[PDB]
């Protein structure tokens, strides 16, 4: 045998090494052919749905979801004990190749990596095809295919069309180095941006309390008041909450909602080249303000789905929705206005006029938290190559990288009906940021329900089916702001 | 919006009678339904809870296995058929529709926790006596 | 989930009803929904959620949740407010909801 | 014994059947009928 | 502790006593002493 | 008399297999 | 000195569903008190709704002008219909402004008044950046949307430049 | 520069941590809802530029600086409690208190309580002294002085107010017409906000409603007026049958190509601010003026060790609530 | 330490996150420190 089975976790100091081994099976895609694909192949009635590209016989390996590398215990042992983590070194191995014919033994499997990032990088878009979360499962390698420039369903002049080690006693391996990225924050701030003040002491700044003397004619006056503990809304502040792009509030109670379709028509979107795209998930904003937990922003969350759920028009219970409540300290709520500006000059003949900022780009002083990562969620994304970017961290969450983990392309060398089964052991190393807090009282952290139940969460049922009961998020620990 | 009941009668101990709830004026599919039983002098007792499309049903302990629940979506009807009635079951039965959710678990949006029953039915008296 | 067997108050006053709860019941943070029924009539949801009054509900009817025991404070007691109140909450260990033991408010006028 | 001889765990690596042409995310329920045999000395 | 560990147990003990003050009933009595010892 | 004979040390350190807990308190001793 | 062979929104793999879901149907339809929240997979067949990590770059809308004198309005709007900034009570035309696609693809006759390979990463100069919900849709009133004419910077924006004074701060100092 | 002063430190809260919230002052506004704590410790605030009975000999003073920034940092809120600008004055040391998370005035479980006694600290009798050396992190120089490729800076409009009341509207617009931002449902006045010019050149009797503490007019070169729009944008398409329409831009995020000036520092104004520890931020310089820092001068926490009164001969387990009245004084050099 | 390879996550200790008048293991408005509940040590699980 050309390799062994490695699954484990090694908790060492400030580092954690995770190793996952899975058995996989790779068929032939496109009958060893490359083929053009487009929207017209489906009929492509919507311009917003218009696309063009090619399907390839190649497969690829997507480990980009966290649940591949962390058992539910390890994710618990992690999130409760640490303020942050981030990958350092990647290591990948493809061993124990077996080739079949249709079933009898035989051939080579071609496999290679793109180190210079020349081929289209499709991993960071959160597609299915990930390694299975439960080590006993066997994951069929998903087909590779890509998209490029288009006009309607037709291609255009600039559109583009796109060496491998050959292998049954052979193996394939490489090592990969994560570039420096900041720790993905996993904590909730104890203080809210506007509560930073010392409640016991006055400010030396002033605010304007009275613009008139009383009731009557010709009452205009200027009266000022010390910004102080009794009135905390008016005090001067050095920093302001992060950017916002409003989402339509949706009531998770069916009755509260409007009795008409509003999915697309009332959705936020951004416009590119005449094609409108839903703004998803969008900038990081707290889902709901304290006191209402049942609402969620429309596309402002990552909506996963439960086991046995799939495809079209599933019920509400089926899909599981992530929660962004913790970032409510530094960030504006997703379905609420940023604030107010004045729309005019007050005259003696005209009252002041205000308006609701729906969206605000960056201003000096804006601080924010990025979107939390989930055990079921993606890990990294690929920063596009452009002239300039701002805060490259990806909008679904995770670590933005200009040079993220390379793709691993794979296909069978060709006909005879043929498929290849094999093994994969992938190893990522993570750096840990320890919890230094001096907080006196015990803090909220993940726990299983001790009460009796039919089944164990994160365990297989009587038919062997494995399921992950709820989205789990990193930020449980608390820092001072 | 209306929720009714039917099927009540005089059972006598030991025999079964189906208990059906027909409902119109609201989408049948988008709401989860409850049955709640009330003895004459005793507080409301929650008999059963069935999710939308009827995929998952979790009975109360007392009635477990001696009741069943069937929800037919096409005719907008809720059917609770029971079995092996004793004289402890003589009481009204209210057809309920769950909507409101216990706050923190609303995102998971399970079949259970929708114990909020905004509106519910007229009730029917099922009397088990010899 | 246990309620007082009887509560009694005079018109024009402040009446309070409180249902203490277990860890399996209210420790989890599950919302506590209050119901009222005029006698011999179908019960009506009163305070959906921890403290919210739905459309078509009097402002005076207000209730909250603290610790394991929710409370409901009616202000400006009216004759129409004499009826049975019921505290429900989900119980984790049971895995099904548990209503309270029932209460009859007594308007003393 | 507080440390008896360790349990020696063994199983066959499951070998899949012909996977369908177009990708299906569901884990594979189809396998080749198989068993293994060998020698054990202790 | 209780969340991350199977067991704990004490190893060493280090005890100190300092910043003594003596009072008289109130003002400082600066010449008084305090008897302190351990039984090992 | 005008000398301080000790500082106020109250903290905890998490080191490997060890945990070091320092607790300082103030006492008052009558007769 | 190059152009992209991929649009910002088409970076997806066409052959694979995401594991992400969206809100497919607010209303069951044709009835009073008939509202149901159905969810659906984001996938290849519907490419507008999928979750995406990066959004196109900032915009400050330019007025549109066409080469054909008939398509244009029969009035002089050169100064009145111009996008400007106001500094010390003096109004200055915005020229050329930030980098934006000069026209939508397929339409070569229209050009920005003060303004095409950047079109993939950048909003067209004439077109609004996007929509924003302007209220809460809760039974009494249906959901509404506004039009965003200009959009500042947001985390996750990527953009192209066009093909430094002494100050406390500057962002992307590359000359306009 | 060097400063030396004199201080008097009392006994706050009878040496007790006491929970506080708006329920003590009644909290009639959701905007003002807060939940937090108050400590018997005091602290030293030199953060403003113009800063730069019997004897008990055995009784002691407790001091520590928090160099890990583990406590809430209240020196960046522009509070009072500064050293006097005049070297001969005697000042009082402000009580230390902080805040934490709330829903209304009640605490979420995420709220964080801190016992300052649980840091290691130095104890001082009348003969001992205290010093430490803080090293500032690198910050930019504060600039003190007066077809295009660059555009003026950001704007979040302020309502204009006249100094002569007759030009001001006959209505109460202080708060109603104010500019603000929303945080988890609470509206908070925008103060001072972005750095912008206080008036158009030629009108000196006009000031921003909440935009100025003073007048920033020196920046009108590179920054637009607080009370004016950033400019205009096209809101539509022109056509043969549709005229060109435009609309005003009342708030402007950062754009590529922008240049701007920060806010000026004053003799009275603050020096530094703590950059909150977060994922991301832009132009971290604090909006009230001064030097932005992730690691400002640490908080210097100080209190007097409590000296108990005579305890009873019998044993009673209740913590001693009878203390000897005591206060301290000394000299501070910075 | 614990080398446990158990797959499903443990029972841990938490502070229940819900709005409350006071914080547990903190001081009430008179500064009386309070320990609301006894805390045992046994949460993590072992094999027998």
Author numbering:
A (entry chain C): 224 to 325, 334 to 337, 340 to 395, 401 to 405, 407 to 653, 670 to 736
B (entry chain H): 21 to 150
C (entry chain L): 24 to 132
D (entry chain D): 640 to 681
E (entry chain F): 301 to 325, 334 to 348
F (entry chain F): 221 to 251
G (entry chain B): 425 to 539, 564 to 611, 622 to 634
H (entry chain A): 241 to 292, 334 to 427, 475 to 541, 561 to 681
Extract from the study:
The AAV vectors are composed of non-enveloped T = 1 icosahedral capsids, consisting of 60 viral proteins (VP), and package single-stranded DNA transgene cassettes. A major challenge for the utilization of AAV vectors in the clinic is the presence of pre-existing neutralizing antibodies (NAbs) in a large percentage of the human population. The presence of pre-existing neutralizing antibodies in large portions of the human population poses a significant challenge for AAV-mediated gene therapy, primarily targeting the capsid leading to vector inactivation and loss of treatment efficacy. This study structurally characterizes the interactions of 21 human-derived neutralizing antibodies from three patients treated with the AAV9 vector, Zolgensma®, utilizing high-resolution cryo-electron microscopy. The antibodies bound to the 2-fold depression or the 3-fold protrusions do not conform to the icosahedral symmetry of the capsid, thus requiring localized reconstructions. These complex structures provide unprecedented details of the mAbs binding interfaces, with many antibodies inducing structural perturbations of the capsid upon binding.
In each map, the capsid was well ordered, while the densities for the Fabs above the 2-fold axis could not be interpreted for model building. As for the 3-fold antibodies, only a single Fab bound to the 2-fold region, in two potential binding modes, resulting in distorted densities during icosahedral averaging. For the sixteen 2-fold binding Fabs, this strategy resulted in maps reconstructed to 2.54–3.56 Å resolution. The localized reconstructions with C2 symmetry relaxation confirmed that only a single Fab is bound at the 2-fold region. In all maps, the VH and VL chains are well-ordered, enabling the building of atomic models. The epitopes for the sixteen 2-fold Fabs comprise VR-III to -VII, and -IX of the AAV9 capsid. On the aa level, all 2-fold-Fabs contact D532 and Y706. Other frequently contacted residues are T491, T492, R533, D556, N562, N704, and Y705, which are clustered around the 2-fold symmetry axis. Furthermore, for all the 2-fold Fab-complexes, movements occurred in VR-IX near the 2-fold axis. While, for AAV9 capsids in absence of Fabs the residues 704–707 adopt the same conformation in both symmetry-related VR-IX loops surrounding the 2-fold axis, there are numerous variations of side-chain orientations in the different Fab complex structures.
